[PDB]
RNA sequence: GGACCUGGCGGUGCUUCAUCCCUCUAGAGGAGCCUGUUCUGUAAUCGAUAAACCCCGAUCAACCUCACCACCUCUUGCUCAGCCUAUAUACCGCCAUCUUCAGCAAACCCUGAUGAAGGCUACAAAGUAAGCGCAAGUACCCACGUAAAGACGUUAGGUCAAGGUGUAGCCCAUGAGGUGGCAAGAAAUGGGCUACAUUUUCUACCCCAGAAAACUACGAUAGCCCUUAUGAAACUUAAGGGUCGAAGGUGGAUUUAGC
């Protein structure tokens, strides 16, 4: 209840102080973040799900937003849509609309829609998929509208930040280069490309043509210069570790191409990107599963 | 697979890239912005930007490959490349002056034709038309099958698949009577296509 | 159907207590080990001599406490001290709370040739963190 | 070996088999069974064979302001005490077993008549000790589902009545007994009906109804007359507050149609003041036994009606041959009468 | 379900009806095109096939689908795009003859298994050298008993 | 007997699906051997045994293990005895299977006149607040994937031989101990390994080589013999060497696995 928190609140504040006074910090400018850090120093847990830890947040957060009950001491509901079931839903529906009206009246790439959980969350509301797909719509309705500065606040609440996803040294000598670093399976290379070179290439302190008797990984080698046309212009140093033949090419490629992509142009490096020289290939070996032959491969079932 | 369904297989084509902004399309302008926001897989360690990386040839050589051994395909396919060209050679200085003027010695539009000469326009029951890459792969399953015969003993696969290819760009040898046999066998069944 | 140390729902008014609740693949996920010594670590030794003892303290713990134990105990080592802490009804009276104390830290002291601490915390009831 | 033991949850689950497909199917016959029984029931700490007396846990701490020490009873007085415990256990063993016998319904066999209880209090101080609730019938309906065939249900018909006036009755499907008795008292308290009874002991007239294939001919009558109706009739008039009535069942007797039917026509009964509010006149009521003296039991309370009502030498009702042939004496019946029980 | 097959039947209907009109297109008309059957999801229309003069009236209806789509807007408004179908009886039969001509060819008992049972004979030469179901409706309950019991 | 409801079924209609079929790769089905089962044999275990048994309990048997057999011995016995004696059709415990599922069960509410029964339409028309499961979260290298998870219920599914336990049975023996012993193939079948080679074999090397290439080829991890390791005990087990160079020549219907 309403008094509950309140009582959950002033103990916070208490136990606020009294973190401040065991961590030996002023009290007045013990921020969460302190907080957070006091407990997880005093009680140390190494459960994986951070939900499990210990945890001494407000009570606002520790407690469910959905709040006691929504009616006073005489009983009427303080929402005028609460009998609706979905008053925090259907009231941002209701003012939705109404911007929709007052774009009638006055008349993408860094960000996604949040996910219904997120909705849930957001409304402390239970929804259905279909209530979502109509809040969505009515929301990407407003955007393709001539939305103003308002409306763009607005539809930002919902904006989700999309995931998507270099240095220049000088050696001893005054030689212009880059380094960088890539992985392939197990391999693991870091690689030095100079501003100015001749195409020689040396991997670990051994010329490529000597170090891999395969045409295939002198191709993969090959691969990044000749998409940029530098090929013959620049000197790269290179040290890969781990992996077979194969392996340590691909990462001696993506670490070429991440070191090279500091001197292409940009047009360049999107080039570069588009052609997947700069993806990490997440393509790992799979794991052998109990009762079966190795990663997918079952049992010969047997003849019945 | 590890890729998510947002990843885009990759292009490798430096022309694609060096295109004049200009002779671009509206629609191709909207492509090329959307790829710049695009995820994209890593560049297979198979394909490169060679200007000698022939795709057809690559998969011939998977094809040919038993047991991951890349290698050891990819050196079978050089291997009979380099005979492709030897034997042409030797015939090219063995002909008259006439006769060099139709002699080819491009290995590589010699294995092409070859395996266009070995594609079967039609298959199979009941008789059916076959797909452009079903055309690729029968052609080429047939010919590595046939390379692969206990028929020929001792010799090896780089003699035997430039014998092959050779017969099939004079269209001869038995793929392409393999192909023809199908042809015959689709003919003699076309009166079953009602189903 | 996976049996391990679950509690299978029946009517939903059975409680259970966090560490019941929780099947077994949640361990080190959400809920931790109900002993802890360095036996089971990389290069360590006498870790069955350690399990033996656990099993044994568990056992000689329910059967010295009836009914008054409200959750599984936990074992901690630091040393050659070993840590009984125990989560108890409020049942008996205190003075029978202490006399069993303090026979179980001795009896225990002498038959594991290691001073045993035993830390009772009581709860009025058993803590129900669900009903299944 | 002291490892290999268990504790006494564990034993008693293995033991007792109380889950399993035994307990699901049946198939075999238990009539040679185990019960659940408490080792702890009145075992003390720090009681044992030795019979020894550890001070602070069996025995007192200080005894006399000091301390005790350590000792141990006599083989005579330890036997007494294990004796001891052996009667007492008998002792709740046998109280255990005894119990109290309660009363039966229609018969003994009948889940009819057989009362519940008032219903489950509401949530907020909704309480209704003034209600009881009674079974008017229970049946096992089987329904045939795709995976296990027949399955059992209980289909529970009760009625619900305070005993003035204000009375219900619901159906209550369930897979449990008293899970259907649970839900079809507690959806009964929201139904409640309001029977209008003329002096609170009977019914103001005469009805006669047919519901689906039911015919109820209920007559009022006057007081000590006694409840002479079906057997559900009289537990429904008893739940309501109707003391004197008589009530024929013809047709089906089905027991829900039969219900709900005698239902519909108590509540759309006529009373006194209403008939008297309608036709604008006094309803004089004429008694034998207080003679020719007129009493009036109820009066308009708009304006009176001066125009006498239309005295017809002949009524245009449709009488009932059953009342005519008793009124004549010439239904002869060797079931009609016959001394029974009070009602 | 049945709605639909009535909507299909309409739309069957009104492209029989733009078929015959010699309004829509003078060379539609002329063409005197058959509709074997119009099934709505867009739509599917399948036409009689009679090889040159049904290459020209596929060809004809294909330029004229987007005139026959406008004008069904005007009746059913919101007509799905149609498609028209060549019905060439088994059309895989026509494409495999065209092939064929267009392709080159080169220089010119008992109902057992005896034999098993007959082995399993030999291998054992070798080795040799009702009742009442009570109804469900009269089962006893002993629940009532309980209850009077206590 | 009339009407209806639910289920089952229809050589029942329609619609849409999946690995159901075709397509792709490598296998099995032919050979030898390893191992498992079955059968026979023996004085000589048990259990699993259609998918969901068949390199299964075993992450493991020369003695031990061992519960089998023969012979001999003991009787308050290691145990305030004991039993691997019967019952998985009394159970706990731990799992298989659908599940490569998404639903389940309570507590209500409503409809059918308060009949059995029924309860969906998103521009929504009686369903629902909670619980369990999926989901989410977490582990591994990501947000993907793989693990894990996977309710209720189905097969009286498996286990009384992990252990515990109900009932029943044994107590000079169905208990306990000691010595010795099986374990062979006339076979059938399941899985696996090695092959039948030239994309191969041997050597060097770890991928720019040289030879071999059909009766002195390829091909045994088999047999025979001799060492060695472990052990008290080895023709038994394993490793190595010698010797032998066998069957076999890419294998029918059918069948397994993979994205
Ligand atoms: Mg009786």
């Given at each position: ?25 002023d009290p007045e400018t013990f921020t969460q973040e302190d907080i957070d850090r006091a407990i997880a120093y005093l009680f140390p847990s190494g459960l994986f799900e951070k ?254 | ?62 094809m040919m490959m038993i047991g991951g051994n890349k290698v050891l395909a990819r050196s079978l396919m050089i291997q009979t490349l380099e005979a492709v060209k030897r034997k ?108 | ?77 630091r040393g050659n001290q070993l840590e009984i802490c125990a989560v108890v009804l409020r049942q008996l009276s205190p003075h029978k709370y202490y006399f069993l104390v303090g ?30 | ?343 | ?150």
């Amino acid at each position: 209840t309403e008094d509950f928190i309140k009582k959950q609140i002033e103990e916070f504040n208490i136990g606020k102080r009294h973190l401040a006074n065991m961590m030996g910090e002023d009290p007045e400018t013990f921020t969460q973040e302190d907080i957070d850090r006091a407990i997880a120093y005093l009680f140390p847990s190494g459960l994986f799900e951070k939900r499990a830890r210990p945890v001494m947040k407000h009570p606002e957060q520790i407690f469910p937003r959905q709040r006691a009950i929504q009616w006073g001491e005489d009983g009427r509901p303080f929402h005028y849509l609460f009998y609706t079931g979905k008053q925090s839903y259907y009231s941002l529906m209701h003012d939705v609309y109404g911007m929709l009206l007052n774009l009638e009246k006055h008349q993408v790439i860094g960000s996604r829609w949040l996910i219904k959980e997120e909705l849930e969350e957001m409304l402390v509301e239970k929804l259905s998929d279909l209530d979502y797909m109509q809040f969505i719509r009515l929301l990407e309705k407003l955007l393709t509208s001539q939305c103003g500065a308002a409306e763009e606040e607005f539809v930002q609440r919902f904006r989700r930040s999309v995931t998507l996803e270099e240095p220049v040294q000088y050696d001893e000598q005054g030689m212009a280069f880059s380094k960088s670093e890539g992985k392939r399976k197990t391999a693991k290379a870091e690689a030095i490309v100079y501003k100015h070179g001749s195409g020689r290439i040396k991997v670990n302190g051994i010329d490529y043509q000597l170090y891999f008797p395969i045409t295939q990984d002198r191709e993969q080698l090959m691969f990044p210069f000749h998409f940029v046309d530098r090929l013959g212009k620049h000197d790269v140093t290179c040290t890969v570790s781990g992996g077979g033949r194969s392996a340590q090419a691909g990462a001696i490629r993506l670490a070429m191409a991440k070191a090279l992509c500091s001197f292409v142009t940009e047009d360049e490096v999107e080039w570069m990107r588009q052609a997947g020289l700069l993806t990490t290939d997440p393509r790992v070996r799979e794991r052998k599963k109990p009762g079966q032959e190795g990663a997918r491969r079952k049992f010969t079932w047997k003849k019945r | 697979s590890r890729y998510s369904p947002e990843f885009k297989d990759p292009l490798i084509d430096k022309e694609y890239y060096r295109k004049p902004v200009e002779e671009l399309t509206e629609e191709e302008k909207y492509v090329r912005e959307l790829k710049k926001t695009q995820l994209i897989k890593a560049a297979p360690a198979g394909k490169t930007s060679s200007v000698f990386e022939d795709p057809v040839i690559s998969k011939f050589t998977n094809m040919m490959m038993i047991g991951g051994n890349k290698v050891l395909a990819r050196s079978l396919m050089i291997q009979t490349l380099e005979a492709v060209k030897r034997k042409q050679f030797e015939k090219y200085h063995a002909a008259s002056a006439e006769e060099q003027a139709t002699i080819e010695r491009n290995p590589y539009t010699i294995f092409h034709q070859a395996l266009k000469n070995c594609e079967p326009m039609i298959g199979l029951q009941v008789p059916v038309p076959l797909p452009d890459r079903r055309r690729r792969f029968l052609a080429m399953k047939w010919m590595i099958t046939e390379c692969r015969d206990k028929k020929h003993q001792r010799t090896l696969m780089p003699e035997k698949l430039s014998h092959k290819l050779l017969e099939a760009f004079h269209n001869q040898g038995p793929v392409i009577k393999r192909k023809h046999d199908l042809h015959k066998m689709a003919e003699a069944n076309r009166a079953l296509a009602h189903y | 159907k996976n049996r391990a140390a679950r509690v299978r729902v029946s009517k939903g008014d059975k409680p259970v207590t966090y560490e019941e609740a929780h099947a077994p693949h949640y361990i080190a996920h959400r809920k931790g080990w109900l002993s802890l010594h360095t036996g089971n670590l990389d290069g360590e030794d006498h870790a069955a001599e350690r399990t033996v003892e656990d099993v044994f303290l568990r056992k000689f713990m329910w059967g010295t406490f009836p009914g008054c134990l409200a959750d599984q105990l936990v074992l901690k080592r630091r040393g050659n001290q070993l840590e009984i802490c125990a989560v108890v009804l409020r049942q008996l009276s205190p003075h029978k709370y202490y006399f069993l104390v303090g026979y179980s830290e001795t009896l225990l002291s002498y038959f594991y040739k290691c001073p045993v601490r035993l830390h009772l915390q009581t709860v009025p009831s058993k803590v129900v963190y669900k009903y299944l | 070996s002291f490892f290999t033991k268990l504790t006494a949850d564990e034993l008693w689950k293995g033991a007792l088999a109380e889950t399993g497909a035994g307990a699901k199917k049946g198939r075999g016959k238990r009539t040679k069974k185990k019960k659940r029984k408490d080792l702890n029931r009145g075992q003390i700490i720090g009681e044992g064979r030795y019979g020894f007396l550890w001070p602070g846990l069996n025995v007192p701490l200080m005894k006399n302001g000091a301390v005790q020490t350590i000792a141990q009873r006599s083989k005579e007085e330890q036997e007494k005490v294990e004796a001891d415990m052996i009667q007492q256990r008998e002792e709740w063993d046998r109280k255990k077993k005894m119990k109290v016998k309660r009363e039966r319904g229609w018969s003994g066999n009948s889940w009819g008549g057989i009362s519940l209880g008032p219903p489950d209090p509401g949530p907020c101080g909704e309480t209704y000790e003034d209600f009881d609730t009674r079974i008017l019938e229970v049946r096992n309906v089987f329904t045939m589902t795709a995976k296990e065939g027949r399955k059992k249900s209980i289909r529970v018909l009760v009625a619900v009545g305070n005993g003035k006036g204000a009375a219900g009755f619901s159906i209550g499907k369930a897979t449990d007994r008293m899970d259907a008795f649970r839900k079809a008292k507690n959806r009964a308290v929201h139904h409640l009906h309001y029977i209008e009874r003329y002096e609170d002991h009977t019914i103001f007239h005469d009805i006669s109804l047919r519901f689906k294939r039911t015919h109820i001919k209920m007559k009022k009558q006057p007081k000590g007359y006694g409840l002479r109706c079906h057997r559900a009739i009289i537990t429904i008039c008893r739940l309501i507050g109707i003391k004197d009535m008589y009530a024929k069942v013809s047709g089906s007797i089905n027991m829900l149609s039969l219900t709900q039917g005698l239902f519909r026509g108590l509540s759309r009964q006529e009373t006194h003041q209403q008939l008297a509010d309608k036709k604008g006149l006094h309803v004089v009521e004429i008694r034998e036994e207080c003679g020719p003296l007129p009493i009036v039991v109820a009066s308009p309370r708009g304006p009176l009606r001066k125009d006498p009502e239309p005295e017809d030498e002949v009524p245009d009702v449709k009488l009932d041959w059953e009342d005519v042939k008793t009124a004549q004496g010439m239904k002869r019946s060797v079931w009609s009468n016959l001394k029974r029980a009070a009602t | 379900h049945a709605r639909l097959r009535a909507l299909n039947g309409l739309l069957y209907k009104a492209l029989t009806d733009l078929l015959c009109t010699p309004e829509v297109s003078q060379e539609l008309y002329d063409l005197n095109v058959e509709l074997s059957k119009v099934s709505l999801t867009a739509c599917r229309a399948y036409w009689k096939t009679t090889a040159e003069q049904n290459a020209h009236m596929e060809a004809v209806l294909q330029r004229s689908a987007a005139h026959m789509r406008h004008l069904l807007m005007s009746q059913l408004r919101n007509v799905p795009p149609i498609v028209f179908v060549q019905d060439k009886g088994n059309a895989a039969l026509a494409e495999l003859d065209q092939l064929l001509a267009v392709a080159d060819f080169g220089p010119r008992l008992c109902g057992i298994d005896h034999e098993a049972l007959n082995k399993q004979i030999m291998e054992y030469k070798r080795r040799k050298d009702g009742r009442k179901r009570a109804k469900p409706r009269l089962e006893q309950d002993s629940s009532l008993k309980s209850y009077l019991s206590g």
